[PDB]
Amino acid sequence: SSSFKAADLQLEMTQKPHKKPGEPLVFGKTFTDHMLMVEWNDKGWGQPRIQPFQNLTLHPASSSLHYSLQLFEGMKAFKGKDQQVRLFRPWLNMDRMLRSAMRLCLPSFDKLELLECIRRLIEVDKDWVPDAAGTSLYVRPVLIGNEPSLGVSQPTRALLFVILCPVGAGSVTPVSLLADPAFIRAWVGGVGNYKLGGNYGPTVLVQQEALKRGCEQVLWLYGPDHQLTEVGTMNIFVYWTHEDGVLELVTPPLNGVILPGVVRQSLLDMAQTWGEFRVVERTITMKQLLRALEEGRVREVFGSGTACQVCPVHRILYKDRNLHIPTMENGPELILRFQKELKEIQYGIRAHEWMFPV
Amino acid sequence: SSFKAADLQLEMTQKPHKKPGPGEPLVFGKTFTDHMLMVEWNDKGWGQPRIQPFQNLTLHPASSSLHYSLQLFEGMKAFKGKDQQVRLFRPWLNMDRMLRSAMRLCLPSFDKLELLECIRRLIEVDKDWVPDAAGTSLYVRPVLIGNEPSLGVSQPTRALLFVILCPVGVTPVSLLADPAFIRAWVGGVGNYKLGGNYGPTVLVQQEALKRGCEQVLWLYGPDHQLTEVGTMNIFVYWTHEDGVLELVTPPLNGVILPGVVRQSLLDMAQTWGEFRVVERTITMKQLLRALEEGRVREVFGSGTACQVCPVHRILYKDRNLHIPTMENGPELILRFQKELKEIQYGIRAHEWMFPV
Ligand SMILES: N#Cc1cnn2c(=O)cc(Cc3ccccc3)[nH]c12
Ligand SMILES: N#Cc1cnn2c(=O)cc(Cc3ccccc3)[nH]c12
Ligand SMILES: *Cc1c(COP(=O)(O)O)cnc(C)c1O
Ligand SMILES: *Cc1c(COP(=O)(O)O)cnc(C)c1O
Ligand SMILES: [Cl-]
Ligand SMILES: [Cl-]
Ligand SMILES: [Cl-]
Ligand SMILES: [Cl-]
């Protein structure tokens, strides 16, 4: 397996630049002037290219639409005061993208070439990256199969493309969650730990049920012991005093039903570095949370992920009865600290190797 | 709201493609006919259905069909009888299944009989692509996809329904049975025909090939239940532990795709009334024991593409189990094939066939 090369980039600037949006942006609805595109076939990878944001033209038998040979990434770029733009830990997104590619028998590529191409693309649309407090550029790489045939097999054609959305988003607002064991997001030996499109379509109906029932997100439970796995599209963390009397930050381990989040890892890294309390990757059950809540040992429950960064939870609707989560009562101190450090790093206030300059 | 066949627009092709040569083999799903059906949906409701030349789709880069697998499909066959009459096999069931799939993915509802008529109209237009050599047919592939130009994970406000056709052209297969592989789970979506269920199986199928097997026998649960064979339902014909001769296939408890061929085989066998016909869990342990006790007669997969597919070998981890399907006729398999053929090619008129 060869790889496309960033040296071979082909650039084509738009003939009529689009009018940028300070006003209300909906997430993922406004895109920039350009996009990256690379084609793969039996002759390997073609030359990458930046081109005006434009429609895909696909054979109607394309395996991307019949058998979900499709995977994506999500990461952010932040514009610092000094008008410099930085990507947050992009190497980890490239790492995960490649593992996802392998799981779906899609073509391998060089993580650094893709990153260089993405850098080049963001450079070209530098000015779309906003700089108002708490804003960023969302980067959405995608790799889809494109075999024009109905056989369920390893494709001999593929498209890799990348589009960009400017986004907005410090009054951290807590959410309520529906926790219903009938809905299972992922299973051991499945593909829940890869960022494949097939993992997301089925959750749309589940999220609608959570809205009809007065909740804002889904808390995905797993196992007959009802383990807390994820919140919506976010990893979940619990800050509590554990059954053994020790203050800790816990998140479920990567046993196959958890998507390894970049924010998740970064929160673990940060907490470990501070050395101020126990940081552990351990299974969390509803039984354990209820008991900890009845003994007042829970301080904060929250989600982590690129879009929200850190999202507090204040209520869980479980077994038809509502559980209050005292997250906001506790500051939320941990949440606020995490947000501030990430913000200082992301907007270049503290220099840090996690940031990748555009 | 629904599209109506009465409103169909027809655009005939100006560039007809050459039909498959007489000395050229039809590889499954690579050759398409000249026309396709196309129906779009948005906040205004369903647009007009069109039969139009086979052509590429134009998709926004953010299309939810490509990021969050808002996609489902179907698979059914049209058969040309000696009288040159083309007929669809139990299409109402595919239409039923397609709508359930759509509901599961918050994709727009449509009228089943309206789509069936549009599909009939489409096949009528391309009727000369329907082959007539024995064991040949026309594969019909309806597809419904969300098409929201937005990265939000939510109910799409636009969708695209299309149908394409492929002309398509009892030798036993070996199966890899390894509990490491899971196709579906209770509380998942294995019982719907959604694109997301198939992509993850490509690597597993490569693993079966590497290990010298032709298909994957999908196992589920601590007790290693036999669920499906590749993209087919699985059936076992044996003398059960209570000494009774039966045809068993797994029940529809969430991890099984309700196949049309499967339902048809249950219906036929129930009608005969010559042996016990049941839907029940089947475990590797039950199979292993029945094999050493010489109780297994035939094991086979069922599905639209193969109809009935015999199994001769199962590689369970490292044990190679011989399945005596072919040493037993295979009597039931042949019987099913013979009866299906009579119904499908119009030899014997039947309510299961829908005339085109
Ligand atoms: N973080 C976060 C978050 C909360 N809602 N939300 C959304 O509703 C959508 C996204 C984008 C996304 C991220 C990962 C997988 C699929 C889609 N992110 C988020
Ligand atoms: N029957 C059958 C059979 C055996 N192999 N096979 C294939 O390799 C492909 C198909 C078409 C199909 C059917 C259902 C889901 C996805 C694809 N069918 C079959
Ligand atoms: C993308 C994703 C996350 C979080 O990922 P980040 O890399 O932190 O943005 C968590 N859970 C699921 C299910 C996801 O798809
Ligand atoms: C389509 C399908 C079947 C069988 O379907 P028929 O309706 O009989 O063609 C069985 N299993 C799986 C996994 C399928 O996708
Ligand atoms: Cl990093
Ligand atoms: Cl992992
Ligand atoms: Cl019927
Ligand atoms: Cl069912």
Side-chain angles (χ1 to χ4, degrees):
Chain A
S1 47
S2 74
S3 176
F4 54 93
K5 258 76 174 170
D8 310 9
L9 264 173
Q10 302 304 313
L11 175 47
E12 172 187 316
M13 301 296 297
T14 181
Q15 227 223 43
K16 213 284 267 64
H18 254 272
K19 213 267 191 167
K20 279 89 170 177
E23 265 165 71
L25 267 178
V26 163
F27 171 75
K29 277 201 168 68
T30 302
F31 303 95
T32 67
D33 291 326
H34 303 71
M35 74 192 295
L36 174 73
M37 170 67 67
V38 205
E39 312 192 335
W40 178 87
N41 64 25
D42 65 6
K43 288 173 166 59
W45 288 103
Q47 302 193 325
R49 60 169 191 281
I50 302 191
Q51 64 189 15
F53 190 94
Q54 65 189 255
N55 291 334
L56 301 176
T57 60
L58 303 172
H59 192 284
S62 176
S63 48
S64 62
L65 298 161
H66 291 253
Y67 312 127
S68 199
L69 288 177
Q70 63 179 239
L71 63 93
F72 65 103
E73 271 303 332
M75 57 182 166
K76 276 179 174 171
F78 305 83
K79 176 168 278 177
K81 289 274 146 151
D82 56 335
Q83 287 288 298
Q84 166 86 85
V85 175
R86 313 185 172 84
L87 279 169
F88 180 78
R89 311 190 71 178
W91 313 276
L92 297 186
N93 299 95
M94 298 302 96
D95 284 6
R96 189 169 72 189
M97 190 171 177
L98 186 65
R99 294 186 308 259
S100 285
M102 299 304 78
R103 181 63 185 76
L104 293 181
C105 297
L106 281 171
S108 190
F109 59 86
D110 188 283
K111 297 186 281 195
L112 297 171
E113 301 299 327
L114 178 52
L115 175 58
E116 178 53 30
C117 297
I118 286 172
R119 193 192 60 75
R120 290 288 297 101
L121 171 63
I122 299 159
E123 198 174 51
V124 171
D125 290 49
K126 271 205 191 186
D127 291 305
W128 282 91
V129 185
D131 54 29
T135 68
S136 66
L137 188 79
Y138 190 67
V139 187
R140 169 50 63 90
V142 189
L143 178 54
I144 60 168
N146 199 33
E147 189 62 26
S149 86
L150 299 188
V152 181
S153 42
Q154 173 181 301
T156 65
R157 268 111 105 198
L159 274 38
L160 197 172
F161 62 98
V162 181
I163 50 175
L164 310 168
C165 306
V167 318
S171 190
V172 66
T173 290
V175 300
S176 55
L177 311 179
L178 171 61
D180 184 352
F183 308 119
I184 297 161
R185 198 198 73 87
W187 197 269
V188 177
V191 294
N193 55 333
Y194 303 93
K195 219 163 181 65
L196 314 180
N199 295 325
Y200 301 96
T203 77
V204 174
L205 182 65
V206 185
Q207 172 64 358
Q208 277 185 13
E209 179 79 355
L211 295 173
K212 293 170 192 175
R213 292 205 65 192
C215 300
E216 291 164 291
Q217 295 286 346
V218 177
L219 172 60
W220 295 103
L221 302 174
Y222 182 74
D225 56 344
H226 302 171
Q227 303 165 40
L228 288 63
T229 59
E230 311 224 22
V231 177
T233 58
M234 297 174 284
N235 295 112
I236 193 178
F237 285 77
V238 174
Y239 189 46
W240 59 6
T241 290
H242 188 38
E243 284 163 359
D244 70 349
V246 179
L247 185 65
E248 66 171 18
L249 179 66
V250 60
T251 191
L254 304 178
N255 74 329
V257 299
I258 310 297
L259 196 296
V262 178
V263 183
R264 171 181 181 289
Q265 188 57 62
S266 300
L267 299 190
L268 296 167
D269 296 344
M270 268 185 302
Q272 281 163 346
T273 294
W274 302 333
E276 303 174 17
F277 47 82
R278 185 164 72 194
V279 181
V280 71
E281 299 183 48
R282 196 200 314 110
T283 285
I284 307 166
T285 70
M286 281 303 300
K287 177 184 180 185
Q288 291 175 343
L289 184 69
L290 287 162
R291 180 188 159 188
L293 286 158
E294 287 177 40
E295 301 175 0
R297 293 188 280 103
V298 177
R299 327 213 333 199
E300 304 174 56
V301 178
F302 55 94
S304 72
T306 296
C308 71
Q309 294 277 295
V310 199
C311 190
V313 175
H314 72 97
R315 186 171 59 94
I316 297 175
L317 177 59
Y318 178 61
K319 284 167 158 275
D320 293 355
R321 93 165 178 99
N322 281 288
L323 302 172
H324 173 76
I325 316 294
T327 299
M328 301 305 286
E329 285 83 301
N330 286 285
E333 291 186 9
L334 185 50
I335 288 166
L336 283 171
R337 187 172 176 184
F338 277 146
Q339 286 176 353
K340 193 180 171 173
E341 195 173 326
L342 290 169
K343 165 215 166 71
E344 290 174 331
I345 289 161
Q346 288 163 345
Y347 295 100
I349 296 287
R350 311 184 168 275
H352 204 283
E353 65 191 24
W354 283 352
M355 303 308 299
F356 175 83
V358 169
Chain B
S1 156
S2 180
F3 51 87
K4 267 78 176 187
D7 304 349
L8 268 159
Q9 180 68 81
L10 169 50
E11 172 192 354
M12 294 301 297
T13 184
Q14 302 293 353
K15 296 184 183 302
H17 201 92
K18 169 265 277 279
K19 312 218 198 319
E24 319 200 308
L26 295 160
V27 182
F28 174 92
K30 300 223 197 184
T31 303
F32 298 94
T33 67
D34 289 320
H35 306 81
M36 75 190 295
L37 182 69
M38 178 67 59
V39 206
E40 308 197 318
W41 180 82
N42 61 35
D43 60 337
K44 306 184 202 172
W46 289 101
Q48 63 161 231
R50 301 182 61 76
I51 290 174
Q52 68 180 8
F54 183 95
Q55 57 190 278
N56 292 332
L57 312 169
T58 294
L59 302 183
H60 194 287
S63 181
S64 57
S65 69
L66 294 164
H67 302 247
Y68 316 126
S69 199
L70 278 170
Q71 62 182 243
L72 62 94
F73 64 97
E74 268 305 330
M76 56 186 175
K77 273 176 181 177
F79 295 96
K80 179 171 277 169
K82 63 162 286 177
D83 34 297
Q84 254 47 216
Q85 180 61 51
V86 175
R87 302 170 175 92
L88 281 169
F89 182 76
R90 311 193 72 178
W92 312 276
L93 296 190
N94 297 96
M95 299 295 95
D96 290 343
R97 193 171 61 193
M98 194 177 185
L99 202 76
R100 296 194 306 268
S101 287
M103 295 302 85
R104 184 62 190 75
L105 290 189
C106 305
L107 287 174
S109 195
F110 55 85
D111 186 290
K112 290 176 286 187
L113 295 178
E114 297 297 338
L115 177 55
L116 180 53
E117 175 58 16
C118 290
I119 288 167
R120 190 195 66 74
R121 291 284 304 276
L122 169 63
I123 298 170
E124 184 170 55
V125 173
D126 280 349
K127 88 272 189 72
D128 304 331
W129 287 87
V130 185
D132 49 26
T136 68
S137 63
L138 186 78
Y139 187 75
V140 182
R141 176 48 66 86
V143 181
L144 179 60
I145 64 182
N147 201 15
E148 185 64 32
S150 139
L151 307 181
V153 188
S154 55
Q155 185 169 291
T157 63
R158 297 184 211 186
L160 197 78
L161 195 162
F162 65 99
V163 179
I164 60 187
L165 311 168
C166 303
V168 293
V170 76
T171 55
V173 306
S174 60
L175 308 185
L176 175 58
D178 189 327
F181 310 129
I182 309 174
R183 195 194 75 78
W185 50 97
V186 171
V189 289
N191 55 331
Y192 302 95
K193 215 169 184 77
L194 312 180
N197 293 327
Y198 304 91
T201 68
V202 176
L203 184 56
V204 185
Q205 169 59 8
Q206 288 189 3
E207 187 67 31
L209 295 168
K210 287 194 300 181
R211 284 202 254 166
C213 294
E214 293 152 303
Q215 299 282 342
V216 183
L217 174 56
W218 298 100
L219 302 170
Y220 180 73
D223 61 331
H224 306 312
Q225 297 163 34
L226 293 70
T227 64
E228 303 255 5
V229 180
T231 57
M232 294 173 289
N233 293 115
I234 198 180
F235 280 83
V236 180
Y237 186 48
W238 59 9
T239 293
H240 188 40
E241 295 169 341
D242 66 333
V244 182
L245 177 72
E246 54 162 38
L247 179 66
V248 57
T249 186
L252 305 184
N253 65 354
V255 292
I256 304 299
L257 195 290
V260 175
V261 182
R262 163 192 187 283
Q263 187 62 59
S264 299
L265 301 192
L266 298 167
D267 293 347
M268 273 185 290
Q270 180 58 33
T271 295
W272 301 333
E274 298 169 26
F275 49 84
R276 185 172 70 196
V277 178
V278 302
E279 297 171 70
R280 189 207 317 130
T281 280
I282 307 169
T283 49
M284 283 304 304
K285 179 246 281 180
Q286 288 172 328
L287 188 63
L288 289 167
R289 183 185 190 178
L291 287 168
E292 54 194 30
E293 299 179 6
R295 296 193 279 101
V296 182
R297 276 142 94 140
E298 300 166 58
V299 179
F300 51 98
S302 79
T304 290
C306 288
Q307 298 290 309
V308 186
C309 182
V311 172
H312 77 91
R313 181 170 70 88
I314 295 175
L315 174 58
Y316 184 37
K317 292 200 289 186
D318 268 21
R319 247 209 291 182
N320 228 2
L321 311 172
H322 170 68
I323 311 307
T325 301
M326 302 310 282
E327 300 85 278
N328 287 299
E331 265 198 311
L332 178 52
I333 288 169
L334 292 161
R335 199 176 163 175
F336 281 145
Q337 284 166 350
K338 165 166 153 60
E339 262 205 62
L340 286 174
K341 193 186 77 65
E342 289 166 358
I343 293 155
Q344 290 170 342
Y345 292 95
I347 289 164
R348 174 194 150 202
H350 203 279
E351 56 168 16
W352 279 355
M353 305 309 291
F354 166 91
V356 165

